[PDB]
Design a protein around this ligand. Structure first.
Ligand SMILES: CN1Cc2nc(C(=O)N[C@@H]3C[C@@H](C(=O)N(C)C)CC[C@@H]3NC(=O)c3cc4ccc(Cl)cc4cn3)sc2C1
Ligand SMILES: [Ca+2]
Ligand SMILES: [Ca+2]
Lengths: 233, 54
């Protein structure tokens, strides 16, 4: 996350961190329920074996609430395309159920039509993660969040060197230097509606981080709500 | 002009659907619709979408 603020105690409880064999985070996820994590399909290519950490806010110290879960089943969208990152979505079934507690709670899955007409028409959503704090920097040891405006689909298409499919949407700023970044991939984009937070996107890709004339590109979760439902069985 | 679900979400806490010519409210899993048919009440600990306070 470039710019934004730390997640304070309790603020980003649906954040998950995918961690490699060296116990380093390489991608985010969103807690959907005690057994399921939502992430980006492209993240699965980034580590041969990986686990999921929840409850973590500071990767440099054990604040007691952190827990690592093994992944039992990886459910990757069969239409994921590395060349355009279309269908950039995966669900992970954990071997053991997550214990909800301070800093660990699921984000709500909304209903499709309501989400598209009412959530995605809000002014902003919130992206969070442990990703780089600038384009060429290192990952953040602190969980961060950032309010990002929803961006008109036309403007976003005009701004992009690469195709924006209907399974993607844009969020962020034209020139202000705030954006998700590398390492935030797979993480939550959620939208607040009356003090309840709903999953609206998955951090997917960008041409750099926070570049002028460029926006953050997210998987459009509302296009996959049936598929998510099915995947969680 | 804004009517039904397009006017302040139909007064619903969460999901609003327009059925015949009227608002129908509903809630995410782990909540129950209140007696007034609009508010959503969490039915257990750690309901989805709530920042944690304990
Ligand atoms: C579909 N393709 C994926 C893709 N990745 C592109 C890119 O510039 N990526 C750069 C260089 C390379 C290694 C990852 C790196 N990606 C990021 O820094 C990066 C920036 C992001 C900004 C906003 C949001 Cl929502 C998600 C991001 C994900 N990754 S350009 C492009 C088009
Ligand atoms: Ca920690
Ligand atoms: Ca920009």
């Amino acid at each position: 996350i470039v710019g934004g603020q730390e997640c304070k105690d309790g603020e980003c409880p649906w954040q998950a961190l995918l961690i490699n064999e060296e116990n380093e985070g390489f991608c985010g996820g969103t807690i959907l329920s005690e057994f399921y994590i939502l992430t980006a399909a492209h993240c699965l290519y980034q580590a041969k074996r990986f686990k999921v950490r929840v409850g973590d806010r500071n990767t440099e110290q054990e604040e007691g609430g952190e827990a690592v879960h093994e992944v039992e089943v990886v459910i990757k969208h069969n239409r994921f395309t590395k060349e355009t990152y279309d269908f950039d979505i995966a669900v992970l079934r954990l071997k053991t159920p997550i214990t909800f507690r301070m800093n660990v709670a699921p984000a709500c899955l909304p209903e499709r039509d309501w989400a598209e007409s009412t959530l995605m028409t809000q002014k902003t959503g919130i992206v969070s993660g442990f990703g780089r704090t600038h384009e060429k920097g290192r990952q953040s040891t602190r969980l961060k969040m950032l309010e990002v405006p929803y961006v008109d689909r036309n403007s976003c298409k005009l701004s992009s060197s690469f195709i924006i499919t209907q399974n993607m949407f844009c969020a962020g700023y034209d020139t202000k230097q705030e954006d998700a970044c590398q390492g935030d991939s797979g993480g939550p984009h959620v939208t607040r509606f009356k003090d309840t937070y709903f999953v609206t996107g998955i951090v997917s890709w960008g041409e750099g981080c926070a570049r002028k004339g460029k926006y953050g590109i997210y998987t459009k979760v509302t296009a996959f709500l049936k598929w998510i439902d099915r995947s969680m069985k | 002009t804004r009517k039904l679900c397009s006017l302040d979400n139909g007064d619903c806490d969460q999901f609003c659907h327009e059925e015949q010519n009227s608002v129908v409210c509903s809630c995410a899993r782990g909540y129950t619709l209140a007696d007034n048919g609009k508010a959503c009440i969490p039915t257990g600990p750690y309901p989805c979408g709530k920042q944690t306070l304990e």
